[PDB]
Amino acid sequence: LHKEPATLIKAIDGDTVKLMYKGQPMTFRLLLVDTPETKVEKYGPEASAFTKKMNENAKKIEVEFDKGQRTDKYGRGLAYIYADGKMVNEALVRQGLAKVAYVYKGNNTHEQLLRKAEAQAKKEKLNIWS
């Protein structure tokens, strides 16, 4: 997989962000993570703020598509997002603000990495695992 530059337009939810990718606005859905929804579930606003803060404070945002389908039925790009080299998907799981979701159409490159982050958050009984 390879990383591509992107520019933040707007954070929408804990699991969704609007980015300028290769010249045009685009909504991205973070791969392999299920965050509480605000559109209001518990930890939903916490997950949203986390994603918002992490992307807004970064100097560089990069998107990394996996090897499976690159967009869902709603037209959102499916990717791993990096804020200053740190994967947003992983940070959410590690902080206990998201659960690892089921693999979707072959996009599983980072599933083990995320499963490990989740096991650790569970052990520490962080947020969602409270």
Describe it.
α2 (88-94) runs parallel beside α3. By secondary structure, this protein is an alpha+beta fold. The protein has helices at 44-56, 88-94, 111-123; strands spanning 3-11, 16-21, 24-30, 33-34, 61-65, 77-83, 86-87, 99-100. The strands form two sheets. The chain has a five-stranded mixed barrel with strand order 1-2-3-6-5. The protein has a two-stranded antiparallel ribbon with strand order 4-8. The protein is globular and about 40 Å long. It has a single domain, classed as Beta Barrel (OB fold (Dihydrolipoamide Acetyltransferase, E2P)), CATH 2.40.50.90. The protein contains three helices and eight strands. Helices cover 25% and strands 31% of the residues. Ca(2+) binds at residues 15, 34-35. It catalyses: Endonucleolytic cleavage to nucleoside 3'-phosphates and 3'-phosphooligonucleotide end-products. The active site is at residues 29, 37, 76.
Task: Record the SSE blueprint.
Elements: E1 3-11, E2 16-21, E3 24-30, E4 33-34, H1 44-56, E5 61-65, E6 77-83, E7 86-87, H2 88-94, E8 99-100, H3 111-123
Parallel strand pairs: 3-6
Antiparallel strand pairs: 1-2, 1-5, 2-3, 4-8, 5-6, 6-7
Helix pairs in contact: 2-3
Organism: Staphylococcus aureus (strain MW2)
Family: Belongs to the thermonuclease family.
Keywords: Calcium, Endonuclease, Hydrolase, Metal-binding, Nuclease, Secreted, Signal, Zymogen
Globular, elongated, flat, extended or rod-shaped: what is the shape? globular
CATH architecture verdict? Beta Barrel
Oligomer: monomer
**Class from secondary-structure proportions:** alpha+beta
Family: Belongs to the thermonuclease family.
Function: Enzyme that catalyzes the hydrolysis of both DNA and RNA at the 5' position of the phosphodiester bond.
Organism: Staphylococcus aureus (strain MW2)
EC number: 3.1.31.1
